[PDB]
Design a protein around this motif. Sequence first.
Motif, PDB file in Angstrom:
ATOM      1  N   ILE A 270      -9.540 -50.431  26.920  1.00 26.21           N
ATOM      2  CA  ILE A 270      -8.984 -50.895  24.926  1.00 26.21           C
ATOM      3  C   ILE A 270      -7.264 -51.331  25.225  1.00 26.21           C
ATOM      4  CG2 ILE A 270      -8.335 -49.180  23.432  1.00 26.21           C
ATOM      5  CD1 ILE A 270     -10.124 -47.706  24.893  1.00 26.21           C
ATOM      6  N   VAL A 271      -7.572 -52.658  24.493  1.00 26.21           N
ATOM      7  CA  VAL A 271      -5.897 -53.486  23.844  1.00 26.21           C
ATOM      8  C   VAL A 271      -5.836 -53.602  22.759  1.00 26.21           C
ATOM      9  CG1 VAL A 271      -5.569 -55.353  24.332  1.00 26.21           C
ATOM     10  CG2 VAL A 271      -7.106 -54.545  26.049  1.00 26.21           C
ATOM     11  N   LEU A 272      -4.346 -52.930  22.027  1.00 28.83           N
ATOM     12  CA  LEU A 272      -3.825 -52.849  21.138  1.00 28.83           C
ATOM     13  C   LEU A 272      -3.086 -54.017  21.001  1.00 28.83           C
ATOM     14  CD1 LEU A 272      -3.690 -48.678  19.749  1.00 28.83           C
ATOM     15  CD2 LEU A 272      -5.149 -51.093  19.309  1.00 28.83           C
ATOM     16  N   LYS A 273      -2.973 -55.272  19.931  1.00 31.21           N
ATOM     17  CA  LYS A 273      -2.868 -56.351  19.621  1.00 31.21           C
ATOM     18  C   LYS A 273      -1.671 -55.896  17.825  1.00 31.21           C
ATOM     19  CE  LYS A 273      -5.136 -59.049  20.844  1.00 31.21           C
ATOM     20  NZ  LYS A 273      -4.936 -59.450  19.636  1.00 31.21           N
ATOM     21  N   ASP A 274      -0.821 -56.883  18.423  1.00 33.06           N
ATOM     22  CA  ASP A 274      -0.687 -57.216  16.729  1.00 33.06           C
ATOM     23  C   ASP A 274       0.144 -55.954  15.642  1.00 33.06           C
ATOM     24  OD1 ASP A 274       0.897 -58.300  14.493  1.00 33.06           O
ATOM     25  OD2 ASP A 274      -0.979 -59.551  13.523  1.00 33.06           O
ATOM     26  N   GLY A 275       1.323 -55.803  16.538  1.00 37.09           N
ATOM     27  CA  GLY A 275       1.539 -54.279  15.744  1.00 37.09           C
ATOM     28  C   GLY A 275       0.294 -52.583  15.638  1.00 37.09           C
ATOM     29  N   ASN A 276      -0.227 -53.077  16.948  1.00 35.75           N
ATOM     30  CA  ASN A 276      -1.229 -52.284  16.794  1.00 35.75           C
ATOM     31  C   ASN A 276      -2.014 -52.899  15.317  1.00 35.75           C
ATOM     32  OD1 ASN A 276      -0.362 -51.598  19.021  1.00 35.75           O
ATOM     33  ND2 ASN A 276      -0.366 -48.964  18.325  1.00 35.75           N
ATOM     34  N   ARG A 277      -2.219 -53.685  14.743  1.00 30.99           N
ATOM     35  CA  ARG A 277      -3.608 -53.446  14.208  1.00 30.99           C
ATOM     36  C   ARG A 277      -4.771 -54.035  14.803  1.00 30.99           C
ATOM     37  NH1 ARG A 277       1.691 -55.453  12.851  1.00 30.99           N
ATOM     38  NH2 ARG A 277       1.689 -55.126  10.132  1.00 30.99           N
ATOM     39  N   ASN A 278      -5.163 -54.718  15.520  1.00 29.94           N
ATOM     40  CA  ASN A 278      -6.569 -55.233  16.440  1.00 29.94           C
ATOM     41  C   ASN A 278      -6.529 -53.842  17.136  1.00 29.94           C
ATOM     42  OD1 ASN A 278      -6.808 -57.157  14.782  1.00 29.94           O
ATOM     43  ND2 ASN A 278      -5.025 -58.835  16.138  1.00 29.94           N
ATOM     44  N   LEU A 279      -7.868 -53.562  17.533  1.00 26.18           N
ATOM     45  CA  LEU A 279      -8.112 -52.459  18.548  1.00 26.18           C
ATOM     46  C   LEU A 279      -9.768 -53.793  18.788  1.00 26.18           C
ATOM     47  CD1 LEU A 279      -8.209 -50.396  20.262  1.00 26.18           C
ATOM     48  CD2 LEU A 279     -10.365 -49.551  18.780  1.00 26.18           C
ATOM     49  N   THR A 280      -9.338 -54.095  20.412  1.00 21.61           N
ATOM     50  CA  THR A 280     -10.507 -54.607  21.305  1.00 21.61           C
ATOM     51  C   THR A 280     -10.858 -53.947  22.031  1.00 21.61           C
ATOM     52  OG1 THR A 280      -9.972 -56.283  20.655  1.00 21.61           O
ATOM     53  CG2 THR A 280     -10.921 -56.160  22.238  1.00 21.61           C
ATOM     54  N   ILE A 281     -11.954 -53.671  22.982  1.00 19.11           N
ATOM     55  CA  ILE A 281     -12.769 -52.519  23.839  1.00 19.11           C
ATOM     56  C   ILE A 281     -13.838 -53.600  24.937  1.00 19.11           C
ATOM     57  CG2 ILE A 281     -13.514 -50.765  24.437  1.00 19.11           C
ATOM     58  CD1 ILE A 281     -13.429 -49.164  21.694  1.00 19.11           C
ATOM     59  N   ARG A 282     -13.678 -53.836  25.384  1.00 18.89           N
ATOM     60  CA  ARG A 282     -14.188 -54.512  26.460  1.00 18.89           C
ATOM     61  C   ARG A 282     -14.990 -53.918  27.630  1.00 18.89           C
ATOM     62  NH1 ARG A 282      -9.238 -57.841  25.696  1.00 18.89           N
ATOM     63  NH2 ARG A 282     -10.098 -59.101  23.860  1.00 18.89           N
ATOM     64  N   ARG A 283     -16.087 -54.375  27.608  1.00 15.03           N
ATOM     65  CA  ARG A 283     -17.373 -53.875  28.224  1.00 15.03           C
ATOM     66  C   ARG A 283     -17.846 -52.354  28.085  1.00 15.03           C
ATOM     67  NH1 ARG A 283     -16.210 -55.088  34.672  1.00 15.03           N
ATOM     68  NH2 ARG A 283     -17.306 -57.267  34.765  1.00 15.03           N
ATOM     69  N   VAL A 284     -18.029 -51.824  27.162  1.00 14.86           N
ATOM     70  CA  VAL A 284     -18.095 -50.587  26.095  1.00 14.86           C
ATOM     71  C   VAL A 284     -18.775 -49.777  26.986  1.00 14.86           C
ATOM     72  CG1 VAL A 284     -17.655 -51.591  23.777  1.00 14.86           C
ATOM     73  CG2 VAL A 284     -19.776 -51.257  24.668  1.00 14.86           C
ATOM     74  N   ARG A 285     -18.828 -49.030  27.123  1.00  9.48           N
ATOM     75  CA  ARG A 285     -19.539 -47.773  28.411  1.00  9.48           C
ATOM     76  C   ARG A 285     -20.328 -46.444  26.698  1.00  9.48           C
ATOM     77  NH1 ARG A 285     -14.174 -46.888  31.307  1.00  9.48           N
ATOM     78  NH2 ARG A 285     -13.541 -45.820  29.849  1.00  9.48           N
ATOM     79  N   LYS A 286     -20.589 -45.039  27.379  1.00 11.23           N
ATOM     80  CA  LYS A 286     -20.864 -44.717  26.492  1.00 11.23           C
ATOM     81  C   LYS A 286     -20.356 -44.081  25.999  1.00 11.23           C
ATOM     82  CE  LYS A 286     -25.443 -43.431  24.371  1.00 11.23           C
ATOM     83  NZ  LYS A 286     -25.755 -44.748  24.519  1.00 11.23           N
ATOM     84  N   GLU A 287     -18.887 -43.676  26.646  1.00  8.92           N
ATOM     85  CA  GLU A 287     -17.644 -42.553  26.390  1.00  8.92           C
ATOM     86  C   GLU A 287     -17.064 -43.623  25.469  1.00  8.92           C
ATOM     87  OE1 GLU A 287     -18.508 -43.405  30.569  1.00  8.92           O
ATOM     88  OE2 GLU A 287     -19.759 -42.428  29.316  1.00  8.92           O
ATOM     89  N   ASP A 288     -17.679 -44.582  24.830  1.00  6.60           N
ATOM     90  CA  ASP A 288     -16.983 -45.090  23.534  1.00  6.60           C
ATOM     91  C   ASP A 288     -16.869 -45.087  22.625  1.00  6.60           C
ATOM     92  OD1 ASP A 288     -14.771 -46.475  25.843  1.00  6.60           O
ATOM     93  OD2 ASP A 288     -16.606 -47.759  24.705  1.00  6.60           O
ATOM     94  N   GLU A 289     -18.181 -44.518  22.551  1.00  3.96           N
ATOM     95  CA  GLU A 289     -18.825 -43.289  21.272  1.00  3.96           C
ATOM     96  C   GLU A 289     -18.813 -42.325  20.479  1.00  3.96           C
ATOM     97  OE1 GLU A 289     -22.748 -41.510  21.444  1.00  3.96           O
ATOM     98  OE2 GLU A 289     -23.443 -43.453  20.738  1.00  3.96           O
ATOM     99  N   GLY A 290     -17.958 -42.695  19.492  1.00  6.23           N
ATOM    100  CA  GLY A 290     -17.754 -41.610  18.334  1.00  6.23           C
ATOM    101  C   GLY A 290     -16.394 -42.555  17.134  1.00  6.23           C
ATOM    102  N   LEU A 291     -15.738 -41.280  16.563  1.00  7.32           N
ATOM    103  CA  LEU A 291     -15.264 -41.519  15.162  1.00  7.32           C
ATOM    104  C   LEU A 291     -13.598 -42.509  15.354  1.00  7.32           C
ATOM    105  CD1 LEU A 291     -15.780 -40.996  12.205  1.00  7.32           C
ATOM    106  CD2 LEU A 291     -13.820 -39.412  13.080  1.00  7.32           C
ATOM    107  N   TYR A 292     -13.883 -43.488  14.642  1.00  4.30           N
ATOM    108  CA  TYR A 292     -12.353 -43.812  15.761  1.00  4.30           C
ATOM    109  C   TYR A 292     -11.916 -44.381  13.974  1.00  4.30           C
ATOM    110  CZ  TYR A 292     -13.567 -45.871  19.851  1.00  4.30           C
ATOM    111  OH  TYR A 292     -14.280 -45.059  21.087  1.00  4.30           O
ATOM    112  N   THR A 293      -9.716 -43.329  14.052  1.00  2.67           N
ATOM    113  CA  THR A 293      -9.489 -43.887  12.758  1.00  2.67           C
ATOM    114  C   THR A 293      -8.652 -44.302  12.608  1.00  2.67           C
ATOM    115  OG1 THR A 293      -9.787 -41.154  12.573  1.00  2.67           O
ATOM    116  CG2 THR A 293      -8.622 -42.267  10.981  1.00  2.67           C
ATOM    117  N   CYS A 294      -8.310 -45.432  11.842  1.00  2.00           N
ATOM    118  CA  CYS A 294      -6.941 -46.183  11.667  1.00  2.00           C
ATOM    119  C   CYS A 294      -5.805 -45.404  10.456  1.00  2.00           C
ATOM    120  CB  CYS A 294      -6.582 -47.259  12.179  1.00  2.00           C
ATOM    121  SG  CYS A 294      -7.164 -48.253  10.487  1.00  2.00           S
ATOM    122  N   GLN A 295      -5.224 -45.033  11.323  1.00  2.00           N
ATOM    123  CA  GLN A 295      -4.709 -44.376   9.760  1.00  2.00           C
ATOM    124  C   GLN A 295      -2.959 -45.023   9.311  1.00  2.00           C
ATOM    125  OE1 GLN A 295      -2.343 -40.699  10.844  1.00  2.00           O
ATOM    126  NE2 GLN A 295      -3.203 -40.078   9.217  1.00  2.00           N
ATOM    127  N   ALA A 296      -2.733 -44.810   8.443  1.00  3.06           N
ATOM    128  CA  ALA A 296      -1.077 -46.022   7.848  1.00  3.06           C
ATOM    129  C   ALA A 296      -0.368 -44.077   7.038  1.00  3.06           C
ATOM    130  CB  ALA A 296      -1.130 -46.633   6.976  1.00  3.06           C
TER     131      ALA A 296
END
Lengths: 82, 82
Positions: free
Chosen positions: B43-69
Amino acid sequence: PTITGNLENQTTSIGESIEVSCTASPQIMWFKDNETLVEDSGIVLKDGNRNLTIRRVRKEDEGLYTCQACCAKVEAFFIIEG
Amino acid sequence: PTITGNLENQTTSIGESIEVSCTASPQIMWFKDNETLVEDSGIVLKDGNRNLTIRRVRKEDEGLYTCQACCAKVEAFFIIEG
């Protein structure tokens, strides 16, 4: 034919990262168990393919990794613990 | 409080990548199942934490993702198939 940089044998806990690199004094190519390195979402080559990064290492990552400049070579075996 | 960018519900096959981003018109923060996003090697955040990348997704990645300002928000649920 003058490779430098941290391709050394190494152990990593499952789910972590490996970051290695080769730099030649030509084109750098990578192998795993003497086969072309299949890039996948966790395997990222950078900078003229000199930097290799593996994220979320799993058991299938374990093996013998070669970086070749084409003719020089370095080999390193990677163990995934845990 | 004006978020834009591709946080949408989505399905991904196990071992692949998810690439999403939020951009606000302040500081961006990310949650998973309403908890702070634990960064890990995949799980890698970039650019002021605007870009989220998840590599080699597994089952535990499943869920509800929020980006808050911080106050605006977008939510998206991620299903890992396969």
